[PDB]
Design an enzyme around this catalytic site. Sequence first.
Site, short mmCIF file in Angstrom:
data_model
loop_
_atom_site.label_atom_id
_atom_site.label_comp_id
_atom_site.label_asym_id
_atom_site.label_seq_id
_atom_site.Cartn_x
_atom_site.Cartn_y
_atom_site.Cartn_z
N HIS A 187 -44.74 15.17 69.83
CA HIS A 187 -44.48 15.17 68.39
C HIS A 187 -44.10 13.78 67.88
CE1 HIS A 187 -40.06 15.77 69.18
NE2 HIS A 187 -39.95 15.13 68.03
N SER B 140 -35.60 12.27 69.85
CA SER B 140 -36.86 12.88 70.30
C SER B 140 -37.69 11.97 71.18
CB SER B 140 -37.71 13.30 69.11
OG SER B 140 -37.18 14.48 68.54
N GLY B 141 -38.26 12.56 72.23
CA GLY B 141 -39.08 11.84 73.20
C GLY B 141 -38.30 11.21 74.35
N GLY C 217 -34.17 11.39 66.07
CA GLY C 217 -34.28 10.03 66.54
C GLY C 217 -34.10 9.93 68.04
N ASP D 259 -44.85 19.93 74.44
CA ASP D 259 -44.45 18.73 73.70
C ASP D 259 -44.23 17.54 74.64
OD1 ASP D 259 -43.73 17.03 71.63
OD2 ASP D 259 -41.70 17.83 71.35
#
Length: 223
Positions: A40, A177-178, A175, A84
């Site tokens: 995402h 995320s990942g 923020g 994801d």
Amino acid sequence: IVGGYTCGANTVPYQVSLNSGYHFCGGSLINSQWVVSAAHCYKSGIQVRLGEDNINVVEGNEQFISASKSIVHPSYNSETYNNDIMLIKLKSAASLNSRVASISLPTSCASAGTQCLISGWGNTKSSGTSYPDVLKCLKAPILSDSSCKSASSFIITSNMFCAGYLEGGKDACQGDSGGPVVCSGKLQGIVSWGEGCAQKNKPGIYTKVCNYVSWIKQTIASN
Ligand SMILES: [Ca+2]
């Protein structure tokens, strides 16, 4: 990261910041030329920033390398966030050193109760907004699927797990995320989603990396 603490410069040497003019997501260095992050987070114009602590100050240990190729999981579903996960290949090999280091992929999955380290430069407030410039860290246990689903009413797949604290107060946030979830020395999760941050009965949802190790290894081997 909400309810966490300042990691300390380069103490999470596998942590990367993805930059498209500004920090927009985290990622994890898994070898000198590959980073894994969340699907995402996908966008064009990604520069991988390694060896970061303060993302607004050049402190001397950074390596900035542009992405040459991004590969979103073939089965990524942006509606459900199922699968994801995304691989990014760097234009050139990072020079590995104590402040720029890969994190091992798991050979087996982790279990409910195991403690993990979650880190990032995301929002540190549960209500409202404050973005830190130095890397933040959080210790959090993996929750059982049934306990997490019952408390949160979240719709999650077998490619996801919950981690955190049902009482609220400690969680990943926008923020982050990942970015990495590391448990027992292995990258077991990727910061994926949630509802709000650090709210009661709404723990973090993380991509279950151990389900993807075949795909990661075959994909890197072929590219
Ligand atoms: Ca910096």
